[PDB]
Design a protein around this ligand. Structure first.
Ligand SMILES: CC/C(=C(/CC)c1ccc(O)cc1)c1ccc(O)cc1
Ligand SMILES: CC/C(=C(/CC)c1ccc(O)cc1)c1ccc(O)cc1
Lengths: 215, 217
């Protein structure tokens, strides 16, 4: 018997989402990037519904809800990719039907970024990150996104406390062998934030270059 | 009482002053020039401070420089933040160089300084103590995530030694909040984010050659 928040978060996990790359269209960076952006777009739609399932989130004002999502969507997407890539080696599982190896990365111009994301994967691998910890870290990442536009700081901190508490309690009961596992999990957040920032900046140097824009 | 924390306390370098020059009329170039020179001198002191962190100088000199290379700005920023806790909407880069909103606009540092203040705000609300400050500073260095680390295991060991010290300190001094250590650790992402913005601003200024950069250049 362990944490109810954690079990609930496991139950609230979105069903698999597919990239669905178009076979008819020949491989090319514009293709890969176009595919990754459509996938992300569809995942973002899902993240909004998913967020309603987070204990303590729906009680925030709509403005604060949007501010948190706006600041943490990339961290949430990246964590997902990372968790799906744990049983793999030097490959990123953006989706079951879209797994990127080194060559597919070079061919898309995502070598640097994908290598940075692989660094997150590596750290979580060594720790043997569990699905329970993964879902709790996603919610924590959302609550701890540090938006400068928050209207109700106290309420946001309460969301953080509730999820932080769930993690600490889960670790206390399932990993008594390492009394600092909760802390180690929290210490992975800086790299997540850092990697998300590099991804966002990348998504701009291309949306910008007229890569696959209109935006 | 905690040994690691006590040691970090006495290992604190003493104050470094900015020493702004009056023969020079205030401008943006003056502010940037001043801040860069201040950072340069703080960096010399930081390198020596790191050698006193338990298990640090014992790492390969490569790993040693790797952690510093990835964490120097976070360490600089945490200092400014800590020194600014007692103030309001002001940044104490040094006792003789306190920047308010007006000065930030003049140096073209309004957005960066506002971001740094966001960090001050969080720590002010938590009532960050000196003991927690020095410990987080050491943790920021050890948890800097350099992509060049040779001995990962040893670096993780260093993180664990500092983390245990923080966890132990919070258990004794703050049994009132059984989650204080975790909350301290949760401020690290904002520290990384703000430092990244600082570094980006810094290298853009260099790229633009906006500041008369010596140093052998
Ligand atoms: C790194 C690819 C990516 C994105 C986000 C749309 C991207 C696309 C193009 C770029 O130039 C940079 C990042 C992404 C897609 C789905 C996820 O679950 C997580 C990340
Ligand atoms: C944010 C100003 C700054 C720097 C350090 C070089 C700076 C200067 C000019 C820039 O364009 C960007 C950053 C700094 C100085 C002392 C500290 O303890 C911490 C940070």
């Amino acid at each position: 018997p362990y944490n109810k928040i954690v079990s609930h978060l496991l139950v609230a996990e979105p069903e698999k989402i597919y990239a669905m790359p178009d076979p008819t269209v020949p491989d090319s960076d514009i293709k890969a990037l176009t595919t990754l952006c459509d996938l992300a777009d569809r995942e973002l739609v899902v993240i909004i519904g998913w967020a309603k399932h987070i204990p303590g989130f729906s009680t925030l004002s709509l403005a604060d809800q949007m501010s948190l999502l706006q600041s943490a969507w990339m961290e949430i997407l990246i964590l997902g990719v990372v968790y799906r890539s744990l049983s793999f080696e030097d490959e990123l599982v953006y989706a079951d039907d879209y797994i990127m190896d080194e060559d597919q990365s070079k061919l898309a111009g995502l070598l640097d970024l994908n290598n940075a994301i692989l660094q997150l994967v590596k750290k979580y691998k060594s720790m043997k990150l569990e699905k329970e910890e993964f879902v709790t870290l996603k919610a924590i990442a959302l609550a701890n996104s540090d938006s400068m536009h928050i209207e109700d700081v106290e309420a946001v901190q309460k969301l953080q406390d509730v999820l932080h508490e769930a993690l600490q309690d889960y670790e206390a009961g399932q990993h008594m062998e390492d009394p600092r596992r909760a802390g180690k999990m929290l210490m992975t957040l800086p790299l997540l934030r850092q990697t998300s920032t590099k991804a966002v900046q990348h998504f701009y140097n291309i949306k910008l270059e007229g890569k696959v824009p209109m935006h």
